[PDB]
């Protein structure tokens, strides 16, 4: 079994078609060497959002292994200079990083992300899933 | 104006074989804060490479980050090797184990000896990396 990272997302103006590039309900497989990146640029980031307020790279999720542990954990890092990244109650500035827990709420600009880590046996690769939310998350 | 440079003194008993031939010394190569510096035998995957069979595809990676309540860049290390361990000073990092590097520390993997030393700067958009060879062992 592979370690999945479920990412429920939300945005006020999502009806315009910001998450058209984003593929929902799909466990896309990533190796542990690779680093998942978010933003607007297509060549730099994997998951893109069509918006001017969003930076070229908003943030990055990188997998790792905690000490005395046999499962992948994820670390976040805000790459935006303008907008802050609210990892739960913690404000992450430019290039500030923090280890993500099993469940957390990410907020930037007017976006709302609800990350949720489901553990797995494999450490060589992980997976990522996306779910569109109708109501606001918080 | 100034840039945060990372002085990296290195050593290997069999460095005479020609392991650090791809590595250029006494030259501060520029890198942006988005980029991640990687180390290993693989040519394209890593920036700084080592011609050796015992070295993994990617041995380890250095990545810049800003600590909280700090105006200068700091570096985090992560061991990408499955087989061989990575010794940060006295701490042993296994597969995908990470740790925030201090100003001065001794990285050790296999028979390689790396002495890192961070010289701070003003800019947080980019960083530098210089390489120096040692005749004697570092430890």
Residue numbers in the entry:
A (entry chain B): 12 to 149
B (entry chain A): 11 to 149
Sentences from the paper on this structure:
TIFA has an FHA domain, involved in its binding to phosphothreonine (pThr), and has a consensus TRAF6-binding motif [PXEXX(Ar/Ac); Ar, aromatic; Ac, acidic; X, any] at the C-terminus for interaction with the TRAF-C domain of TRAF6 (TRAF6-C). TIFA exists as an intrinsic dimer, and phosphorylation of TIFA at Thr9 promotes its oligomerisation through the intermolecular interaction of pThr9 with the FHA domain between the dimers.
Although it is difficult to discuss the original effect of pThr9 on oligomerisation even with the use of these results, the crystal structures of T9D/C36S and T9E/C36S provided structural insights into the assembly of TIFA. The buried surface area per dimer in the hexamer formation is approximately 1,400 Å2. Glu39, Lys40, Glu45, and Gln57 (main chain) in Mol B, and Arg34, Ser37, Glu138, and Gln140 in Mol B′1 are involved in the interactions.
